[PDB]
Amino acid sequence: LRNVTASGVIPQISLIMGPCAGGAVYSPALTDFTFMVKDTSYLFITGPDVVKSVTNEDVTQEELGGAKTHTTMSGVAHRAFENDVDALCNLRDFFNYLPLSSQDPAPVRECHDPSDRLVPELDTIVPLESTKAYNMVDIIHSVVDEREFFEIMPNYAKNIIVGFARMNGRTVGIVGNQPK
Amino acid sequence: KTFDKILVANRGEIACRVIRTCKKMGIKTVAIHSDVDASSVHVKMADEAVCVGPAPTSKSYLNMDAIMEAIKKTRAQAVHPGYGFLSENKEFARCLAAEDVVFIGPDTHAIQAMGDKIESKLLAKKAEVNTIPGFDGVVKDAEEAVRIAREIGYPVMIKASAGGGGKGMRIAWDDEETRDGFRLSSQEAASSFGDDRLLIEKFIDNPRHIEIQVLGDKHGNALWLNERECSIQRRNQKVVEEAPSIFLDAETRRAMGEQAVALARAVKYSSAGTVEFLVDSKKNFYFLEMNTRLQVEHPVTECITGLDLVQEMIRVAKGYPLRHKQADIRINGWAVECRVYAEDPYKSFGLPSIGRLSQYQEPLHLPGVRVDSGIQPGSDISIYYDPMISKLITYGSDRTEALKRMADALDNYVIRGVTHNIALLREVIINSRFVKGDISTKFLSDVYPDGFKGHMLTKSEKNQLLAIASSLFVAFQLRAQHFQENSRMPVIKPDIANWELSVKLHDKVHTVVASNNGSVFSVEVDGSKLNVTSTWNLASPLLSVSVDGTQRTVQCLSREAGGNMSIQFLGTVYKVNILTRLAAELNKFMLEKVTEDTSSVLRSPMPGVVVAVSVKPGDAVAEGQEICVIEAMKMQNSMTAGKTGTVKSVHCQAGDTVGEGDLLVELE
Numbered sequence: 001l002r003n004v005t006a007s008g009v010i011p012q013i014s015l016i017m018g019p020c021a022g023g024a025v026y027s028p029a030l031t032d033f034t035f036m037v038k039d040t041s042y043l044f045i046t047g048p049d050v051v052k053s054v055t056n057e058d059v060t061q062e063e064l065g066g067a068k069t070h071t072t073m074s075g076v077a078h079r080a081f082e083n084d085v086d087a088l089c090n091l092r093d094f095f096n097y098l099p100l101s102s103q104d105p106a107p108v109r110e111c112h113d114p115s116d117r118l119v120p121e122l123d124t125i126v127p128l129e130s131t132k133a134y135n136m137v138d139i140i141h142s143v144v145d146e147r148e149f150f151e152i153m154p155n156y157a158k159n160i161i162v163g164f165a166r167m168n169g170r171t172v173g174i175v176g177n178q179p180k
Numbered sequence: 181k182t183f184d185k186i187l188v189a190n191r192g193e194i195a196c197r198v199i200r201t202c203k204k205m206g207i208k209t210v211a212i213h214s215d216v217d218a219s220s221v222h223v224k225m226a227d228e229a230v231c232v233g234p235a236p237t238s239k240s241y242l243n244m245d246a247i248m249e250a251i252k253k254t255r256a257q258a259v260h261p262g263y264g265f266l267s268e269n270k271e272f273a274r275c276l277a278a279e280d281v282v283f284i285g286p287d288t289h290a291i292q293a294m295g296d297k298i299e300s301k302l303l304a305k306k307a308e309v310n311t312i313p314g315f316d317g318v319v320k321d322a323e324e325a326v327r328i329a330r331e332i333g334y335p336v337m338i339k340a341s342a343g344g345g346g347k348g349m350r351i352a353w354d355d356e357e358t359r360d361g362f363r364l365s366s367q368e369a370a371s372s373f374g375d376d377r378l379l380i381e382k383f384i385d386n387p388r389h390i391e392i393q394v395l396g397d398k399h400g401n402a403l404w405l406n407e408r409e410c411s412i413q414r415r416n417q418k419v420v421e422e423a424p425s426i427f428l429d430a431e432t433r434r435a436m437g438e439q440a441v442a443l444a445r446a447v448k449y450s451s452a453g454t455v456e457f458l459v460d461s462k463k464n465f466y467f468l469e470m471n472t473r474l475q476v477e478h479p480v481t482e483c484i485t486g487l488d489l490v491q492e493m494i495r496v497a498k499g500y501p502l503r504h505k506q507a508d509i510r511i512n513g514w515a516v517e518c519r520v521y522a523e524d525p526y527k528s529f530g531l532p533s534i535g536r537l538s539q540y541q542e543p544l545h546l547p548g549v550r551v552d553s554g555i556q557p558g559s560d561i562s563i564y565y566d567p568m569i570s571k572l573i574t575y576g577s578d579r580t581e582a583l584k585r586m587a588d589a590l591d592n593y594v595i596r597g598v599t600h601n602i603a604l605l606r607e608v609i610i611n612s613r614f615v616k617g618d619i620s621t622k623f624l625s626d627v628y629p630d631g632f633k634g635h636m637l638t639k640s641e642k643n644q645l646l647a648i649a650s651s652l653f654v655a656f657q658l659r660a661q662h663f664q665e666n667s668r669m670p671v672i673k674p675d676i677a678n679w680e681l682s683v684k685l686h687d688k689v690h691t692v693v694a695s696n697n698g699s700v701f702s703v704e705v706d707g708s709k710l711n712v713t714s715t716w717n718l719a720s721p722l723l724s725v726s727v728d729g730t731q732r733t734v735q736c737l738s739r740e741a742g743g744n745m746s747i748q749f750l751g752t753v754y755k756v757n758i759l760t761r762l763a764a765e766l767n768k769f770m771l772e773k774v775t776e777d778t779s780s781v782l783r784s785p786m787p788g789v790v791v792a793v794s795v796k797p798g799d800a801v802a803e804g805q806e807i808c809v810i811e812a813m814k815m816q817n818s819m820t821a822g823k824t825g826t827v828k829s830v831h832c833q834a835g836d837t838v839g840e841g842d843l844l845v846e847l848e
């Protein structure tokens with residue numbers, strides 16, 4: 001009830017740092033972003049013991065609800081990090097993008113990247129031949145402040161790119177296609 | 181006065197050089213390009229351009245028939261091919277002259293005259309240069325090997341009458357090992373390729389490669405310019421050259437310059453070209469070869485002679501005499517040139533890389549620096565062409581000023597998107613043997629007997645690198661806290677007086693404590709006190725810092741939240757992982773799991789039909805090299821290699837249909 005009430009009012013971030021079973025597995029479904037730790041965190045309602053007892057299927061703890069499954073195939077986890085220390089370091093960086101509440105404007109931070117510079121690298125990215133793919137990320141990185149881009153679900157639904165970046169100090173969200 | 185319109189039959193910086201000179205002269209310049217070179221710099225700089233053909237050069241820059249069509253289509257009067265492609269192609273010059281188009285370069289007589297080694301040696305004998313005699317006969321006896329050497333000279337080489345690759349070769353100096361070398365080769369060589377006839381000739385020790393340039397005149401005149409020292413090379417290609425050698429005094433320069441002219445005036449070489457000499461440790465100069473074409477080492481002599489070679493070649497081709505006399509040619513200072521390639525210097529000294537350029541900034545704000553480049557940001561470098569990026573030329577009043585300015589230009593020279601060879605150039609020019617001049621044509625092979633490893637840091641340099649990396653780390657941490665104030669939710673900046681860091685380099689972990697005093701960070705690195713002062717503009721590709729009075733330029737190439745930073749320091753990229761004290765103390769509890777690097781296994785990223793495979797087993801593969809092209813929903817998904825090597829097996833062929841995850845090619 002609180003997680004639903006807070007939706008659209010305050011950001012809700014849930015980082016999974018270990019196994020999660022039963023009803024607990026639904027709170028990340030109500031928050032805004034879910035992150036995991038590779039080979040350490042799990043998300044599933046019932047364990048492999050129930051799957052084997054109910055149906056004639058063979059599965060282990062990583063296959064059923066491991067971080068790799070949820071960041072690559074089911075689309076449940078927004079990103080997995082290698083270990084606990086790196087996971088929290090990236091979480092601090094992610095935090096700095098978001099406002100404290102929905103009543104606040106997108107945060108604006110000190111920026112040294114001139115807002116009026118040109119990016120000549122863009123003129124030749126897009127081929128004239130219609131059947132030749134190009135990497136959309138090259139455009140995104142060249143436009144955003146200081147070439148910093150935070151990519152969400154890098155391994156899931158690769159044909160569309162979404163993520164956070166700053167332009168002239170202000171946090172923006174970026175959505176685009178990946179022709180590759 | 182001069183030509184109204186000149187066509188250039190080349191691409192890249194050499195085409196740019198001609199376009200700039202023509203514009204200075206008021207001459208319209210026509211460019212040619214392939215379909216992939218349509219956006220290259222020389223195409224945009226030229227006044228008119230004609231597309232000739234597709235990406236491979238054999239159909240675009242060596243297609244003389246398509247070029248002839250472009251020459252007449254634009255009503256060009258003269259053609260300047262630069263170097264490389266059709267500069268020595270006689271059939272091109274013949275069919276070009278047949279149409280009364282002025283060719284800028286050698287005529288076909290000079291090209292054929294030096295066509296082979298026999299005519300070149302005969303010219304050196306007639307022009308009277310050197311070409312040291314050998315033995316015009318077969319050595320048969322045990323005493324002939326030494327008796328003949330006694331009549332001609334001292335350093336004597338024994339080699340097979342025909343063959344190579346060590347086919348009984350030995351180097352001898354005195355008579356005892358000359359006799360021994362012959363009889364060994366004459367009795368064992370018969371067991372290799374069935375031939376035991378030995379010849380003797382004369383050799384030199386630690387050679388230096390020295391060029392002298394000559395400007396020919398159609399009226400019979402010819403002048404010689406200052407020499408070039410071209411000893412730093414890999415895979416028989418030069419990378420660094422110096423103009424005002426060091427191995428010559430005033431008399432030697434005149435003596436050798438006159439001989440280079442004697443060659444040019446005896447074949448009537450009314451063009452610009454180069455004569456190559458080898459000099460031994462005793463300052464004995466021997467003829468090596470005569471070249472007919474503007475060299476790639478012509479932008480370093482110009483900085484000390486004050487000439488413009490392209491301007492002069494165009495007037496000579498029009499029919500004007502040389503504008504100078506020999507008494508006016510002198511050394512006005514010193515100039516050194518470095519060639520920058522898109523190559524990995526670690527992989528057997530220069531393995532080509534493939535890629536696109538995302539950041540590019542030439543050091544043109546520094547004194548005494550001239551950058552001659554054919555690329556612009558958003559340029560691609562590919563397997564079809566020699567991976568040249570630029571030629572960096574630095575000049576000064578003395579040898580130390582030109583070298584110091586070169587070192588500065590290399591650290592302020594931004595190339596990102598490809599792998600480059602700046603680390604190699606930055607270390608060679610500062611090598612104690614290079615500064616003193618003890619350089620031979622095999623210099624790099626003795627300095628780097630196990631390959632290129634990168635710049636090696638000493639104690640003080642490690643302290644400066646640690647202090648810079650630690651201060652830059654904190655500078656980002658402080659910038660992260662400066663928000664516009666939100667009147668609803670006050671933000672309180674943490675009062676962090678000291679930053680306690682654990683800074684891991686290669687295999688060592690250093691203890692660093694930093695504090696901020698405004699623009700300067702006071703950093704203690706394992707007990708050593710350093711003060712790093714800067715403006716700390718964190719967006720610029722070039723960050724200028726002063727560490728205890730020492731001026732450094734560094735580049736931060738990448739940053740991660742986990743503390744990983746990639747910092748280029750003195751040309752070499754160092755990997756440093758900066759954790760806070762707390763993160764480093766707890767990180768020891770993490771399991772050191774290691775995964776497999778399966779970069780040799782190239783699988784299809786997308787279902788569809790295979791339309792091209794660029795390889796067969798044994799083919800060389802560069803990083804980023806296209807291997808396979810798949811075709812689905814009428815597109816051309818290109819699959820590239822992530823590993824340098826050769827192909828071991830090609831599993832899917834063109835015409836085959838593959839799914840997601842199927843194996844296409846397997847590398848060694």
Ligand SMILES: CCC(=O)SCCNC(=O)CCNC(=O)[C@H](O)C(C)(C)COP(=O)(O)OP(=O)(O)OC[C@H]1O[C@@H](n2cnc3c(N)ncnc32)[C@H](O)[C@@H]1OP(=O)(O)O
Pocket residue numbers: 019020021022023024045047
């Ligand atoms: C669907 C209903 C809901 O809303 S959630 C329903 C709750 N049911 C469960 O999740 C079953 C509990 N176990 C599991 O799901 C999995 O086996 C888990 C525990 C997640 C796998 O983790 P694993 O690393 O194997 O841990 P473990 O089984 O050794 O347990 C570690 C220690 O914690 C304890 N523990 C665990 N779950 C409970 C629980 N529900 N109630 C009380 N204690 C629990 C274990 O006894 C164990 O303690 P000890 O090591 O035996 O001293």
